[PDB]
Amino acid sequence: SGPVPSRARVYTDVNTHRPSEYWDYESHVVEWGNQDDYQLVRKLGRGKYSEVFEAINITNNEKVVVKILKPVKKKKIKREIKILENLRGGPNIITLADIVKDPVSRTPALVFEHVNNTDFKQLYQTLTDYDIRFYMYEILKALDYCHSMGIMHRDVKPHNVMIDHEHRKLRLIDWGLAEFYHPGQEYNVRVASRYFKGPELLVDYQMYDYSLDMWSLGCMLASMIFRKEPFFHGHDNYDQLVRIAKVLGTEDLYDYIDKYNIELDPRFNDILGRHSRKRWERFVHSENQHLVSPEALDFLDKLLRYDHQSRLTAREAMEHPYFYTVV
Template identity: 40%
Template sequence: MSISIRTTQVPHTSRVYSTALAFVPESEWNSSSNEIEWGNPDSYRIIKKVGRGRYSDVFLGVIENGKYPCAIKVLKPIKEERLKREILVLQRLARVSDVIKLYDCVINNDNKTHSLVMEYVQGVDFRTNFPLFTPREVQLYMKHLFSGLDESHKLGVMHRDIKPENLCYDKERDVFKIIDWGLAEFYHPQKPLNYRVASRYHKAPELLFEYTYYDYGIDVWGAGIVFATLIFRQSKALPLWRGATNEEMLQRIAEFFGKKELMNIIERCGCVVGKTVFDGIPNTADADFKQFINKENEEYATEAALDLLSKVLVLDMDKRFTASEALKHAYFKEEYE
């Protein structure tokens, strides 16, 4: 059930990279006017299955002519436009070092299955990896993440599903990749978009109250939730706020920040949330991240880390740090042994 009664929403333009695609040929971003050249899968061999998702199964493979490893993402039946958009996104981001590389697009002519052949990175599941990170490794991880996001945003691309499962990190080699661009979208100012993106725990507030004129800031909020998970050493790598529904997520966020500011933002965006959603929640709250500090995480949750967190987890999308601003923060200048 929808939690928002959508009225006439107020269009919004990102304060950064709003014209990133203004002079880019339409063929590089418009999936409806683009045809993909599909190759032959015979050059690749599947070794074993290494992952699965809602829209694909992922296999470790090899490129036969040189026996180089690769990841083969075998796609389940999805809309052609979405498939084309993911390919166009990966092609546009080909030179971004912290984004997974696309090698080839192939089709099995026997069963008409489409696959994306991609760079393979030997990563470790975040539930295993996160608890083992040192403060320095957390810093490196977040620097990679914000760098990858900033470079993608510069090119006019939003990931729209930032969460630990979509971040692959080989800490032994300090190799980091943002993966799974299946929900990604090209940003065009004041163009309404589908708000049903991102995973619930990592949704920015504007997605939760169903605003359609969001921008790159939804990726920054998702990165902030990942950062909070890392510095507060949440058991089982759980995110900061949890709710069984989008409505509960809005309530948890309002309890932390106070409902007055959130309600003002919802009204400013031209959205209307059900009258009872915020019942019993105070108008104002301390919004103090220090409440999450304990003996186990105090080494990670430094003053600079908390200050950065307070600037990326901001309700107002106009005041939320950009990825570029996050990279310039004092937290990334802290020295660790």
């Protein structure tokens, strides 16, 4: 009979009702500018798909961020460009400012707005309960916006969240794995970083949606409020589901597999075992109790659910009592 189909509970048909120009990235015309307007300043980081640099726009002495793209399918570069162009100016979304190529190497490069990621290690003040609520709300604004625009980020994790704490500014970056949501489409499950992969990815359920980002956000919330990084510490993709099952329990996992008629990989036979569903209160310790509250655990419980359909949407999350105190 095969797996039972699924579709997003929200923003289901936003790409369906838009003209193809919006979501047909393969047909998008990229106009590559000239990289001489920029001087590279320093190396910011290295990724699987890119090298990120701090730079100066020499025409106006303004700091920019330059992402030089590593060898990848032309289709993937076009997808990222089109998504960034569609989301440009959205709340807490990194802003694409220019698309350039070095006249000699012809290597593709994306130019973005500068974001000054705070060195948190050099602050007397440690993370507070209010800080978590404030920045979790800013991420949600970004996710509700991109989901409303028919886009799944698919790589929500701390390294893809830039925070300028002095200006209380947050930006969701690296749209390289992002994809347009089309109801009924079967997606590649080899997305997201291991610790942040949703159970749908781990059981190879391809008909996933925006709710994938909500699981990733829940992993980030658990790691912050409990001071346990990462929260689900798998050593491989199969072991990752086992770490999740040791907290959410095996009974709800079998209800999830049964509901969607999911074919479970035989590699899971000898490793899943039997696990009770743990209370979230059991992760509270003297070192994290200032970040934990009944509201925070109720909110966490509503994100970290096997059933992608039963997770809060980004808009439902924004209305949770956990955020009543945020501006």
